[PDB]
Structure 1
Amino acid sequence: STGQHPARYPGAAAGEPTLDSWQEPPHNRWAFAHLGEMVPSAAVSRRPGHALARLGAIAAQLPDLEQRLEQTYTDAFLVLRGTEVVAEYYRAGFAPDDRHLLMAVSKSLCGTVVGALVDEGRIDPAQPVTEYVPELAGSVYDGPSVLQVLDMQISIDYNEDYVDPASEVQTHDRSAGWSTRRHGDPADTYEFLTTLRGDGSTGEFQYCSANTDVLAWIVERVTGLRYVEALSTYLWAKLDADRDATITVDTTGFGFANGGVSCTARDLARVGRMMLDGGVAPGGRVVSEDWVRRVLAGGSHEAMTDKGFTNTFPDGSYTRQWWCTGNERGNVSGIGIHGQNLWLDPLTDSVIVKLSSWPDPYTEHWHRLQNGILLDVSRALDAV
C-alpha cells in the first residue's frame, strides 16, 4: 500500500477514474473537461515552415551561433537579459509559443515547489522522508532526510541500462506511462518508488530521477494537492506565464515530476528570472531569498563524484535539484537529457533557455558542444 493520495477530483475514490471508467458517473463530469489526462490527444490549431532567428546583439560576437544551434539540434533558444528578451531562435516547424518537453529541467521546478513549502514551514529538510511518507518505510528512502533527496545524496541500486527492460530506468518509465507496461510492473509511480533499495549509505551524489518523484510525493502529503495543482499554485500561477505548462501523469493522475513538464521557452525563462530576482515572481514570492542563495551557493563539492560533470566543471556540485557549475561565473543550471537547459548567469542578470532534441540522451560530445554555447553566450553578455 502507498497510502493516501490526492483525489483526481473532489470526492473521487482512490485511483479513479481509470482509462476504463472515465465515461461513467460520477467521473465523467471531471473527465469530460480534462480528457487529455486520460487519453492521448492532439491539438487542432486555431491558426492557419522556416526557422526564426533573432539573435540580435550577440550575433556580432557569435557570428556562427545559428549554425551552432542547428548542430546541437536546437528547437527553441531564448536569452533574457534582465527583463528583456535579447535573443531568440526557433527551428523550422517550432513556433515561438509552442511547448517543449523539459525532461529533467522539470526537477528544478519540483525543487522550487519544495522550497516554497520549506519557507512556509510545511517541510523541514532535516526531517526523514518517512516523516511525510511513512509508506516509504522499508525502502531505500527509509532513513535519508528530505535534504538528502533534494541533493540526491542517497545510494540507490538503480540499473541505468535502458537496453534492459528489467532496469530501474525502464521500469520507472513503464510505471509512469511513458512506455508500454509489462506483466509484473508496479501499478503506478508511488508503488515503483517503494520497490527501490540501496546499501544504506548516503552523502555521495547519485543522480536518480526517482528522488524527484519522492519529493513530489512529499509535496502531495504535506499540501493535500495533486502535484499537478501544487506545481501551479506554488510556482506556475505566480509567473504571469503566457501559457499553461503541461505535465504527463500516470494512471493515478500523479505528475511525472522528474521529467514530464512541457512549456514555452519564454515561460521557462520566467522561472530563471524569478531565481535571479531573489525568489520573487510577478504573482508573489515563490521561494525565500535564502533558498535562492543556497541554490546559487552550490552543494558539497566532495559529494559530487560524477566525472561527466566535474571533467567540465571541476568545482561543480548539486543542490536542491539544480546543477551548480562552480565556475568563475557561478553558473547554475537546470538540465535535462537530449539538450535541455534553464541556465542562470547571475553576473549579467541573464537567463538562457535552450530546448533541444539531440538524437542521444547524453554523450560527452553533445555536452561539450552545448556547454560551449551556453558559456560563449553568457560571456557575450558581459560589459565590454
Structure 2
Amino acid sequence: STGQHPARYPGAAAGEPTLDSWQEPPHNRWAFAHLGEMVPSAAVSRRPGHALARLGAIAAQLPDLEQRLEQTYTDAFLVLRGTEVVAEYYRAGFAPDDRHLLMAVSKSLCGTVVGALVDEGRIDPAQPVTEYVPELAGSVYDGPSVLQVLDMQISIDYNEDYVDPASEVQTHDRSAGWGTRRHGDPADTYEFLTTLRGDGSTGEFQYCSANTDVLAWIVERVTGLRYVEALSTYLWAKLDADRDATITVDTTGFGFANGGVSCTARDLARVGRMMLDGGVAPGGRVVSEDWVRRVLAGGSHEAMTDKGFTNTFPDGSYTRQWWCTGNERGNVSGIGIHGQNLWLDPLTDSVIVKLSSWPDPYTEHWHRLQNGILLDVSRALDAV
C-alpha cells in the first residue's frame, strides 16, 4: 500500500481510469478531454527540412559553432542574455517551437517546485521523508531527511546497468511506463519506490533518479495536487511560456518527475531566467531569493565523489536537484542524459539551453565536447 494519491479527476476512485476503463462513466468525461494521458498519441499538424542557424554575435568568436553543435547531436540550442535571445540553432526537422524531452533537466524543475513549497512553509527540508510519506517506512527512504533527498546524499542499492532488465534503472522505467512491463514489476512508480533499500548510510552523493520521484510524491502529499498540476501551478504557469510543457505519466497519472518533461528550448530558458532573477518570474515569485542563492552556492564538496563530474569540475557539488560546477564562473546546470542542459552563467546574466540526442546516454567523450561548448559560449558572452 502506497497511501493516498491525488485523483486523476475530481471524485475519481484510486487508480481510475485505467487503459481498460477510460471509456466508462464517470471516467469518460475526463478521459475524452485528456486521451493523450491514457493512449500514445500523435500530433496532426495545422501547419503545411533545413537547419536554422542564427548564432548571431557569438558566431564571430566561435566560427565553427554550428559544426560543433552538429557533432554533439544538437536538436535545439538557445542563448538568452538578460531578457534577449542572442543565439539560436535548430537541426533540420526540428522546429523552433517543437518540444524536446528534458530527461534529468526535469529534476531541476521538480526541485524548484519543492523550493516553492519550502518558501510557503509547507515543506521543512530538515524533516524526515516519512513525515510526509509515512508509507516509505521500511524502505531506504526511512530515516533520511527531505534535504538529503534534494541533495541526493542517500546510499541506495540501485543497479545502473540498464542492459540488465533486473536492474533498478530498467525496473524504474517499466514501473513508470517508459518500457514494457515484465511479470513481477511494480504496478506504478510509488510502489517501485517502496521496494528500494540501502545500507542506511547518508552524506555522500549518489545520483539516483528515484530521489526525484520521492520529491514529487512529497509534493503531492503536501498539496493534494497531482504532480502534473503542481508543476504547472508552482512553476510552469508563472513563466509566461509560449507553450504548455508535457510530462509522461504512469498508469496512476503520476508524472515521471525525474526525467519525463518535454518543452521548447525558449520556454526552458524562462526557467533559467527565473533563477537568475532571484526566483521571480513574470507571473510571480516562484522560489525565494534564499533558495536561489543556496542553489548557486552549491552543495557540500566532500559529498561529491563522482569522478565523472569532478574530473572536469574539481570543486563541483550538487544541491537541490542542480549540478554545481564550482568553476571560476560559478556555473550551475540542470543536466539530462543524451546531452540536455539548462546551463546558468550568472556572470553574463545568461542562460544556455542545449537539447540533444547523443547516441549514448553518457560517455566521457560526449560530456567533454558538450561542456567545452557550454564553456566557450559562456566565455564568448563576457565583456571585452
Partner Cα separation in structure 2 for residue 245 and residue 46 of structure 1: 19
TM-score under structure 1 length normalisation: 1.00
Mapped partners of 1:255, 1:4: distance in 2: 16
Identity of aligned residues (%): 100
Q: 1-side partners of 2:242 and 2:145: how far apart?
A: 36
Quote the offset at 1:308 in angstroms: 0.2
1:348 CA displacement: 0.0
- In the alignment, the residues of structure 1 paired with residue 366 and residue 55 of structure 2 have an alpha-carbon distance, to the nearest angstrom, of 21
CA-based RMSD: 0.1
Instruction: Give ranges in structure 1 of 5+ residues lacking alignment.
Output: none
Deviation (angstroms), 1:350: 0.0
Q: How far 1:207 sits from its partner (Å)? A: 0.1
Deviation at 1:64, TM superposition (A): 0.1
Please name the residue that 1:56 is paired with: 56
Distance in structure 1 (CA, Å) of the matches to 2:162 and 2:148: 25
Cα displacement (A) at 1:96: 0.0
Deviation sequence 1:158-210 (CA, Å, 0-9, x none): 00010101000000000000000000000000000000000000000000000
The two structures have a TM-score, normalised by structure 2, of 1.00
Report deviation, 1:273.
0.0
Give the drift of 1:29. Answer: 0.1
Q: Which runs of 4+ in 1 moved over 6 A?
A: none
The Cα offsets for residues 28-62 of structure 1, whole Å up to 9 and x where unpaired, read as 00000000000000000000000000000000000
Q: Kindly state the Cα deviation for residue 16 of structure 1 after the two structures are TM-superposed.
A: 0.1
Please give the per-residue CA displacement for 1:270-302, whole angstroms capped at 9, x wherever unaligned. 000000000000000000000000000000000
The structural deviation recorded for 1:352 is 0.1
Q: Which secondary structure does the structure 1 equivalent of 2:301 belong to?
A: coil
* Deviation of 1:110 (Å): 0.0
Deviation at 1:233, TM superposition (A): 0.0
How far off its partner does 1:369 sit?
0.1
Where structure 2 has 5 or more consecutive residues not aligned to the other structure, the ranges are none
Residue 337 of structure 1 and its aligned partner are, at CA, apart by: 0.0
Measured after TM superposition, the shift of residue 383 of structure 1 is 0.1
Is 1:7 aligned to residue 29 of structure 2? no
TM alignment of 1:76-155, pairs within 5 A: 76-155=76-155
1:300-358 CA-partner distances (Å, limit 9, x unpaired): 00000000000000000000000000000000000000000000000000000000000
Q: Report how many aligned residue pairs link the two structures.
A: 384
User: Cα deviations across residues 203-262 of structure 1 (Å, max 9, x unaligned)?
Assistant: 000000000000000000000000000000000000000000000000000000000000
1:17 aligns with 2:22: no
Q: Per-residue deviation at 1:111? A: 0.0
What whole-Å deviation, never above 9, does each CA across 1:103-161 have from its counterpart, x for those lacking one?
00000000000000000000000000000000000000000000000000000000001
Taking the aligned partners of 2:313 and 2:173, their CA distance within structure 1 comes to: 30
Q: What per-residue deviation string (whole Å, max 9, x for no partner) do you get for residues 52-102 of structure 1?
A: 000000000000000000000000000000000000000000000000000
C-alpha displacement of 1:26:
0.2
SS of structure 2 residue aligned to 1:302? helix
> Shift of residue 381 of structure 1?
0.1
Report the Cα distance in structure 1 between the residues aligned to 2:311 and 2:260, rounded to whole angstroms.
Answer: 28
Distance in 2 between the 1:126 and 1:254 partners? 25
Instruction: Indicate the SS of the match to 2:323.
Output: strand
In the aligned structure 2, how far is the partner of 1:255 from the partner of 1:105?
14
Indicate yes or no: 2:262 matched with 1:262: yes
What is the match of residue 272 of structure 1? 272
Looking at structure 2, the residues matched to 161 and 264 of structure 1 have their Cα atoms a distance apart, in angstroms, of 30
What are the equivalent positions in structure 2 for 1:1-384 lying under 5 Å apart? 1-384=1-384
2:13 and 2:241 mapped to 1: Cα distance?
Answer: 33
SS of match in other structure, 2:205? coil
**Partner-residue secondary structure (3-state), 2:369:** helix
